[PDB]
Amino acid sequence: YKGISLNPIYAGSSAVATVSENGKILATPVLDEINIIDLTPGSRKILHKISNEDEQEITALKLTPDGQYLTYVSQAQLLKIFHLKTGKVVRSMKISSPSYILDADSTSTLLAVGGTDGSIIVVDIENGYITHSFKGHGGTISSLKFYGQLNSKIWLLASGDTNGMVKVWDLVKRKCLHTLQEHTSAVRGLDIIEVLNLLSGGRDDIINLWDFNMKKKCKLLKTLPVNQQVESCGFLKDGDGKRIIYTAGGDAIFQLIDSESGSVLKRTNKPIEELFIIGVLPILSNSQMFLVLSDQTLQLINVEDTIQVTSSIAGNHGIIADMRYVGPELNKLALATNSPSLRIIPVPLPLDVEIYEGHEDLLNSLDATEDGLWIATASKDNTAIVWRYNENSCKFDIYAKYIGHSAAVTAVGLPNIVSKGYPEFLLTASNDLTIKKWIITRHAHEKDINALSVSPNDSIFATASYDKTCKIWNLENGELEATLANHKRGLWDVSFCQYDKLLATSSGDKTVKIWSLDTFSVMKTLEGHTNAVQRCSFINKQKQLISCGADGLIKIWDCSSGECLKTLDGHNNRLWALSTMNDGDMIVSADADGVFQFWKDCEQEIEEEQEKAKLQVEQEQSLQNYMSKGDWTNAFLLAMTLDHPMRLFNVLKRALGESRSEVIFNEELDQAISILNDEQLILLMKRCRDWNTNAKTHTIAQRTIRCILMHHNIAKLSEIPGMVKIVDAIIPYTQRHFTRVDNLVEQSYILDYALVEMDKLF
Template identity: 45%
Template sequence: MDLRTEYSNVDIDPFYIGSNACSVSEDGQLMASANFEDIVITNLATNEIIDQIDGDGELITNLILAPNGLTLGIISQSQNLRVYDVESKTIIKSFKMSSPVYVSAHDSTSSLFAFGGTDGVITVWDIEGGYVTHSLKGHGSIISSLCFYGNLNSKNWKLASGDTQGVVKIWDLTNRKNTHTFKEHASAVRGLSFTKSGQYFLSGGRDEIVVLYKDLKPIKTLVVKQSIEVAGFLDTQADSTELYFFTAGSDNLLKIWDADGETLVNQTKNYQTEEELVIVDAIQIENEQMYLVVSDQTLVKLDLSEFHTQLPVVSRIAGNHGIIADVRYVGPQFDRLALATNSPSLRIVDPQNPLSVEMLEGHRDLLNVVDVTIDGKWIATGSKDSEVRLWRYDEEVQRFKAYAVFKGHVGSVSALGLPRTPVNEYPRFLVSAAGDLTIKKWKIPKPAGDEVQVVKSSEYTRRAHDKDINSIDVSPNDEFVATASYDKLGKIWHLESGETIGVLKGHKRGLWDIKFSPYDKKIVTSSGDKTAKVWSLLNFQIEQNFESHTNAVQRAKFMNKGTQVISTGADGLIKIWDSKSGECLKTLDNHSNRIWALDIANDGLQFVTCDANGQISLFDDNSEEMGKLKEDEQKLKIENDQRLNNYISQGNFKNAILVALELNYSMKLFEIFTKIFENNQHEELIDILTQLNDVQLVSLFTKIKNWNINFKNFEVSQNLLYLMLNHLSLDKLNSSKLMAIIDSLIPYNERHLNRVENLIEESYILDYSIEQMNLLS
């Protein structure tokens, strides 16, 4: 059987991480997001990253995209404002701010940016002109919110600002003065908004209140029971008899209020979790839609058209997945990825639409592990909340739904195993391991409609290891279960009885993973001792030891009908091994951090790896394509060699030189030039040299330099140099590349000249000696 070593890969990289800096264009098409010190621009309509902007080495503190999506303002901890033209992909202006900036705003016409500094100074920037129009001073503390109203240079051209002391100011930008100051809040003001007419204005703060103003006079104070991070009028296009506004912030809640009746109209938690998440921004876009930016760097797109009754989730986007602890191919076609990340929600990602993510909620703490049946329709997840959950694929809606919850462990669930034989109506059992050092076998209940069933008692519980259990695998015939632990042992158990039938001893450090071979009576383990080992299930002895990783081996699996093993490590490397010889056939260096997760599909034709940075790499076997490419290359090489030999045998040195240069055959060229000089065909050679183009000349001079180093070859190189320097025009020789090569020739030429001069001197001595010997005779 052919061994697989050739793979092409596609990476799904995080595009929003390390900062709350994120901005979306008015039409919802473009998003700019911070990726530590760099910036990524994403087309949300096509789910493609269209541009990446290198940072200045400091973390991004704020960025803002103009409503038309053409201009981007970027500020980092260096306090340097960079204005970026999205279409030309160039920085068009830079400006040093007086202090760090964490908040900004734009006007509706894409003409102005406003930036609020930690020194209380507000800087207004003219986008087209590329200069500061206003520097507004008056706040005594850090600026925490900004909002424009009106048109450039009009009579009602205003800017509202709020600070961390609860002060709100209204600025007349035409007359460059502060017209109103309000002290209605007791803490930072995070939300400011005007209606289209400007008659109504609101401010919302972390003191959990919203103040409504009419004609810039406070008229109402509403307690919203929520620390506000963003607030605004729901429809800023026009005022109506009914006035609605929204608040968002703590508890991951978006609330919509009727301002007239002072009542809560709708309350939406974009997903249920006990994780302490905050909505850091709410961006209204066209078509009555809104993006919620959540503190875990996910974006939730909501439909606001029926906000009185519901707020349907249009889509979710994951800016990053954080640390990915486990991964499985899932779905009837195994065309999706189930991710266990540092989030309580199970994430389902379609690699064809990689930015969007489906979140399955239910767990109350971070996920550790995920497993799937061989038909891809049943997923089991284990969490730090000590629970195991089972999810079933619903053919009708084409998504996974909660099926059952298993409660009984008293520690974080760390490993799971589902049946490896075909599933009829539903899988019959589930095996789990947890921080309580036990394994449990559970009986899965029969389907009961849409009811999520709760199972509280297991078929058996066994104290399995002395330290944490990191991995479970079920044998291909569902007869045995294998466990791997930090106690340096792997154990084989009889599934039905729960009795130990074998112990794997030999690793020097804790085990991370254990997997059965689908075809042979073998099992592979991976360990913190930097090795992976293949064991016989007949005598539980080591058959093969894989040593090449430079750090802990996190995952290992058989593939290609058991003839190969693939492993991933804390060194960020993927290694493919011959399971019989133990030879490392291929090393893939595609990750920059520890690879926690690995899964294979189609017995190794595809596999996926995920690391601690949240990078997902998808690999596809392209051995057939590479084999054909190598065959074509070999065939072409044979044809070119034959063509070259024909030219040489025919004495057609011009074409022979051109072909040898094209193929980069250094010694063939040397042989050709040697024959030319032996036959004294200097005139023909001069004609050939003068017809070479710039690329061919550089290639030839490079080879002359290499020949010139060796004393045995220097005669040919010196003859060639003489002809080229004397017969080529200065225009051809006067290029930086050629001059650099010629300069490097000088030291060797001087050495050859000294050697020749020494030989001449020695020849004089020899002549004198012979002459004196003749006199004696």
Template identity: 40%
Template sequence: METTEKTAFEAVSVEPFYTGGKTSLADDGYTLATSFGEDVVVTNIKTGEEICRIEGDSEILTTLEISPDAQYLVTCSRSLTMRTYRIPSGELVRSARAHDAPVIVMAIDSSSSLVATGGAEGTVKVWDLERGFVTHNLKGHGGVVSALKFFGEQGGSVWRLASGADDCKIRVWDLVSRKCLKVLDSHNSVIRGLSWSSDGGILVSGGRDKIVNVWDANKFKLVRTIPVGESIETAGILNGEGLRIYTGGEMGVVKIWNGQTSALIAAQVQPAVHNKENERVGVVDILYKTDKLVSVLSDQTFVELDDDLKEVRRIVGFHDQIIDMTYVGEDESKLAVVTNAPDIRIQTVGGIETNVLTGHRDNVIAVDRSFDGTWLASSGKDHEARIWHVPTLTCFAVCTGHAGSVGGVALPRLPLEGRPPQFLITGSQDLTIKKWNIAKDGTAKAEYTRKAHEKDINALDVSPNDRLFATASQDRTAKVWDMNSGEAVGVLRGHKRGVWSIKFNPYEKQIVTGSGDKTVKVWSLNDFSCLRTFEGHTNSVLRTVWTSLGSQIVSSGGDGLIKVWTYASGECAVTLDNHEDKVWSLAVRGSDDGAQMVSGDGEGTITVWKDISDEEKAAKKAAAELQVEQEQQLANYVRSKDWENAILLALTLNQPYKLFCLFRDVLADRQDEDSIMGLTKVDNVIAGLNVEQLELLIKRVRDWNTNARSSVVAQRVMNCILVNHSVDKLSQVPKISTMTDALIPYSERHFNRVDEMYDESYLLDYALNEMDFLDTPQVV
């Protein structure tokens, strides 16, 4: 097979956009604003495209809200400043001090006219969104305002605002009369959700006291109390017939209740997802727009639900630290992503949609895939390894028996031909390796157990023919083992630090390792000697993989770099830099021999790398051919003394010496005595240059002016530029002041040299006169 070495890649990053905190969804159902640390990211969750990213004011965001028409974004932070931005440009419209304490909650009315803010000091303010002034200053709460909800539209006969606080009271404000109509008191904990019915006759409130209250908003009386059995973080009323109330809280599922009978109508069926602390993931908010329910979970994911509360899709806002990754699926269109959590995310390549595999009881450490990508193996800190069927997202087998964290796992490399994997290799912190026989019913039994290393086992790999497997350890060695007997057949010694990665070459009897000593080593499987050592990383090498039919190696390191090494030359073909943190995970798509690969770092960023080596070679070839054609054309212009086109083409080709020769020859020929350059056409060419061309020419003049031999040409050209171009146009040239500053000292030096030569010419005149005097006959 023909080997095409990879020398260029195009990067597409899937960056995190939500790290917890407030979120807001516009009425269109897809323009989502999310907190990202101190910043705000506005994303189109339909396409996954980032609309804009707005930098914060170096203080933690306390709340944000996007207007229903998706035209404005309002943010508040601990700096007590409220900022209004225009979407999608991200332009700052205004900035104002909002309250005397941080703003905790915010709401915008349905007409995108008013914005209400609730402060930690208990005050509620209403602002004109368009013009930015305060319309209402509402006081009365005895604690932090925790919930706000508008009813009605500006200019309507009924225009109300409900506010809840941690004083456990709800206040209903009439914005027309600017009075508090009623104080509703029935909760005994913080109120987190408020919602009006479409006609304004019903007000629903939910709190952390595990109840939802239904209020008659006309008589201001409690109609019904619904015990929901969990601490509520959000509650609201669904559109349609009857009073249906949605809730979400600590249990992590969305529920719908009958507001007239208190009966549970439906509950979301969801796996028990856990975060990195192994705590159950809860619902922190529910975004309800255009009859679409989107629950926001505490693990920074978004779940879109249909009318029956079935999951339509799940969107990842933040991966946290990405520990391992591999392509899965028959078409390798998905990634299995390990994020230092008990659950595995199956995510679309280059997208934000994901599914979740749940089952591990502690953080997952490593994953591996079968040849066809339909089976996935995982291992974790719960001392277990699991085999998953990817198309059905189900667990097929569980391997239990290690006494420590299982740091490496490997599946067979030969095609499975539609059957489940028949064995699995695992390596553990208990210093042992195990081969598991997997029965057709998913039963797993250890065939043998061997003590393998003196320290933790970091990685495993199985040979292409399934006859060998290899282990990499923190004890600075790697070992090769016989699959059938489980006996070591070779030890790879030479690394000075722990070995983090190991991979068999699919096409040659070679194996590659990456180590904490910052090197990549290739070893022979014939005599287990080191064939090559690649040096270039400035931190530990964390992952290594083969590509280009086994002729190249890709490595990623703690320095955030990815390097592609060519084995034959021993050199780095290309260094890829798109990460700011350690690149822990690296995977190459096997179906096209690495034409696409992915990398993940400690900040949760996934980068998809597309091989564009052929395109780059074609572009370089086309550029070289064009260069030859243009150089020939330039020669033709010079031969025919077409100075105008010759000068313009020399500028375009960026050939300083040829351009200098053109000006020098024109000055030497000097056909027009009235011309600065010696030819009126050349003067006109310089006079007609645009700003970009002027920048190039002044750079050349600056360089020529540093040498006495070329300074005459430089001075003439600069004179022509100054005569023919206005100060306004020259001021548009980038870095013009820097370039002129470089011109002045050399020009002064040239002037002083000429001045000295002029003075010395008087001595020559005197000497000549004296010589004439000596030649004249003297009369005695």
């Protein structure tokens, strides 16, 4: 299968991603690595991932308005500078006490770092040296803000401590001008308003205006009381003279507030999910604001009663409860995750997410109707809801909701749907034992339930448990067709198959079984997993069934054979769930890890082996045609490709015999020796090494060495790996044959002696 791995762009350690003034380019960190994905309309690509150290974690990372360089801080007290153009770390240095806050100005020349201890050092972006070091206030530094003009003789740096103290350090003056402990809590966000007034975000709730000057005079112009934590704030030019400060809060409600009055012109959202926006990266000139949410998602909001997000990009899905395909197109896969919302992701680089949050419960189960549209959600919260699956437009609804029962909805399964697209009923179950079938309560099994699945005829249904039993009850009435006998220690999944007509069972031990309606008993028994099976997905061709497993590996087998066909080992630490594309077999694998992957069945690879097996049988008959009649150049090559030594040696027998009137063999054969590969000069000389052993195959070896020496550059022959050890065996046999041939010349002058004593007689 052509499995494609999927990874999360924003994950692990909390940090603020750095984006450039232009929409394109973005930086996110997952564990040790940092992933940079350029942002362009219609194209998403990841430039590169920095390996760094897997053991180390990333406290924070920063990108300049123009993305020339990427700056990140490791867990160890050192600073690593990365150059975007060459993808190489130009400089690295120790920042002593680690500083989470890094501030970059529009110009990339100056970068500010805040230590854990509260000591702040300013480092030039271009050269890895510290222009100056400030002892600063004796507290952790919450944030710093730089002020600059493309060309100016005045530069102002503002630093915010954990306590409500703001020091406006002046770089040219090298003095701390001002102290403003108006704030009673650490200042999380500082924004320097254009001329001079200083706006400081207050962690406690107070957002405080200030007057800044080179001279001592400074005063508090205004104080704004907002009912949210000020995570970050900024000044927006839009709205002219009445600039509306941009405020980010713990509740995640973005607020634009009049300057002249404390009233809020417009609030972009309130979100049902209980998340806080860690920090906001705003282009400002482009009037685009990026909000990093506490549910690990990024929302793009334009700046002009409720702010409307232009698009939503989800950096990482922490956990996928289950994988179920939804929609007519089938491009987007509905995601069941540990959150109180439903996320719809498109199927093919950052991926945008459609998100629906019908209930507060993290989704604990999910299901979609086979003919296209509907989606149904099972959650920890007792409420169970049905979702409107339109494929046309961006419209989505959740019209039906079900009161039911006082425990979490373990799983929602709908046997059937009517031809108008309305579900007939919902069977659903719990952490307790109270198992219910609501149309639009039964009990089964003393402990928590695990899975619910259905047959295309609505006749039969089955459900599974931790106390080891599977129950098959009538769908129409309130009747019990039977009970399955038991599995070894707890049944994680139950799956019906259309062609076979079987009920498969996954377990909490490493065994899978196949169960029958007719006898209520085990048809087949499987083994050779490590941990626990978790989910079993039906296969499109109804033969090659797919089981997942809580040891990170997925495996494929046929019920009729009973034997393992294939194993897939491409995921990291776990597996939880599995999806199959209905129309064409594509196995889609879902885990505790934030990686994801799409696999596919590939008869096509057999046709590669068919053409390879055909090619030999094709070329042997040419070879035996060449071995009939000559054309020994082609008889050499097809021997050299398919490695028949005795048929190759017969060519070099005949090639010497035909070469009886520097050219050592046939001339076109000599050109064929010149084009021999490095793997072929090993194999030819190795066969030539064998031929040098006995004196009958002797000279046929020696003429083949003479070509390779006469028709190659000999600097290759030392480069070639393992070729020297072949030369160790060739040489002392040649010296042995050298005396042996020369001694036949020494005996040969008896013929010279038989002339001289004879010609004297004459």
